[PDB]
């Protein structure tokens, strides 16, 4: 990988050894890359794919893969990376901010235990169970709310707004720490079983293949005009 200030470029070479112990490089392919900053990349010989992991200009995680032997167009096949939780949680006037925020924080796959634990440790200035972690988050934020409620005569709307503000404070902290723990670090690609994994600083993530319907639905519009029509149907 030849990092240039304008455009990165991949190059796959085959080592050829002549009779006279003279070694030379045979050029197989040359694949250009967008302005994204490369983190790690590895390529297999079973599938002949170049797996590479970048960060775009907004510091989001971008993973792609390309076959370096059947590359007639130079196109990188996308990988649908999971996006970070939303900055704002939209609450209807019928749900309670408490339960909505708890459901959004304790839903499977959204927040890591380490992020919520760090947010608690900071908000307060042991290896707790998830239910005890739920009760502990609720207790810390209930305490912050009772500290922020200064008057005895606070109306229901003002009390609800204070509820939302303190829970959103805690959620923004949890999201900051999940963004820190979600930083991509390197790639692990199994050569024999084609198992691909994206190693992040906080956890480990596996890459599974995608069906045709979801692939057609989720691919960006600019890459949908190049989909091979012989794959969808004869």
């Amino acid at each position: 990988y030849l990092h240039t200030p304008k455009q990165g470029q991949f190059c796959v070479f085959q080592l050829m050894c002549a009779e006279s112990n003279r070694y030379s490089l045979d050029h197989i392919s040359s694949i250009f890359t967008n302005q994204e900053t490369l983190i790690d990349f590895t390529f297999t010989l079973t599938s002949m794919d170049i797996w590479a992991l970048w960060l775009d200009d907004d510091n989001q995680t971008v993973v792609k893969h390309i076959n370096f032997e059947e590359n007639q167009a130079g196109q990188w096949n996308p990988v649908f990376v999971n996006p970070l939780p939303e900055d704002d949680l939209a609450i209807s006037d019928e749900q309670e901010p408490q339960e909505a925020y708890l459901e959004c924080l304790f839903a499977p796959g959204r927040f890591t235990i380490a992020a919520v634990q760090k947010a608690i440790q900071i908000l307060r200035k042991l290896d707790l169970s998830w239910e005890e972690l739920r009760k502990d988050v609720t207790l810390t934020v209930e305490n912050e709310i009772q500290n922020a409620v200064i008057d005895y005569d606070v109306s229901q709307e003002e009390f609800r707004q204070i509820n939302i503000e303190n829970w959103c404070k805690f959620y923004t902290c949890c999201l900051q720490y999940q963004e820190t723990l979600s930083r991509p670090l390197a790639l692990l690609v199994h050569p024999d079983t084609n198992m691909v994994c994206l190693l992040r600083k906080g956890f480990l993530s596996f890459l599974a293949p995608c069906s045709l319907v979801e692939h057609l639905y989720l691919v960006p519009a600019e890459h949908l005009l190049t989909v091979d029509e012989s794959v969808i149907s004869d």
Partner: protein, 322 residues
């Protein structure tokens, strides 16, 4: 030690739900509505403690209403009166057909009933959500809480996230309705702005029943799983007191109407006889543990320290010595 029922009254069929009248009717006796397999019997209960003249219990069936379906819950109306000048017998009964039957009578010939349809799931509990007795709230397994007027028209529908198990009207504060969802999330709904005021949480699941304390409005009691749970407001959503009630499963929670510390929890009709454990807030163990062969339905006497569990063709009354 199993406590023998102080009073036992023989009935014509298995009692599926027994409910005392929590409102003053104007008569010496306290009304009792027990709903059986296909009927709802209105009766009058005079006790020895209430009147010395009465020896034991004077049980008199006043009016029998053919229901046709298994009565699963009975809600007394505030307008119910036994006044000589103008008698009115109004009550709402939900059944195993997802329908509400409002029986309005005058204790003499006139008998009227109104089927209210709309629920797509079995109604677990229903109450009159109005001080004037104009509105009836019903919670069910369709994840909805519906407010119905006397003419059978839905006024408001609150979408719950769980099957609503128990609905209760706030004793003093108006326009406040407590809905106890099965996942433990008990919610309070305003009946004017139609918005969720607050949401309490139970540590254990499933929340089978919930009741307000008439003497102390702040104290809320419920039965989740095997343990009974007490909350006290405006303090926290966390259980204040949480002690085991029954070994198998606790089903019905009812607060005493004469005392703010006594409450009764009934065990679930299953491998063991449906036991009743009348607990006391001060005492770690129940003050009275009685056994009913098959018991469903629990209600507390308005003035006396006495509770009733409807057994098989019998009514078991237990007196709690204060």
């Amino acid at each position: 030690s199993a406590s023998n029922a102080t009073y036992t009254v023989d009935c014509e069929d298995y009692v599926h739900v027994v409910e005392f009248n929590p409102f003053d009717s104007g008569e010496a006796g306290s009304l009792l509505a027990y709903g059986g397999i296909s009927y709802v019997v209105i009766a009058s209960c005079r006790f020895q403690e209430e009147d010395s003249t009465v020896e034991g219990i004077e049980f008199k069936t006043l009016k029998t209403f053919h229901h046709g379906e298994r009565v699963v819950a009975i809600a007394w109306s505030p307008e119910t009166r036994c006044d000589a000048l103008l008698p009115l017998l109004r009550f709402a009964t939900a059944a195993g057909d997802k329908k509400i039957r409002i029986f309005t009578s005058d204790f003499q010939d006139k008998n009227e009933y109104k089927v209210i349809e709309g629920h797509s799931g079995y109604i677990n509990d229903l109450v009159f959500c109005s001080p004037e007795g104009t509105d009836i709230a019903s919670v069910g397994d369709d994840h909805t809480c519906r407010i119905w007027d006397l003419d059978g028209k839905q006024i408001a529908m609150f979408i719950l996230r769980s099957p609503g198990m128990s609905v209760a009207w706030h004793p003093e504060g108006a326009f406040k309705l407590m809905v106890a969802e099965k996942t433990g999330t008990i919610r309070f709904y305003d009946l004017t702005t139609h918005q969720a005021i607050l949401s309490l949480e139970s540590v254990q699941v499933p929340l089978m029943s919930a009741d307000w304390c008439v003497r102390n409005t702040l104290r809320i009691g419920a039965v989740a799983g095997n343990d009974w749970i007490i909350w006290e407001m405006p303090r926290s959503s966390y259980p204040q007191d949480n002690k085991p009630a029954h070994a198998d499963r606790a089903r019905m929670f009812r607060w005493s109407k004469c005392n703010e510390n006594v409450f009764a929890t009934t065990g679930y009709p299953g491998k063991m006889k449906s036991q009743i454990a009348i607990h006391h807030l001060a005492h770690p163990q129940p003050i009275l543990i009685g056994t009913a062969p098959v018991g469903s339905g629990l209600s507390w006497h308005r003035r006396l320290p006495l509770c009733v569990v409807g057994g098989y063709r019998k009514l078991f009354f237990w007196l709690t010595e204060m």
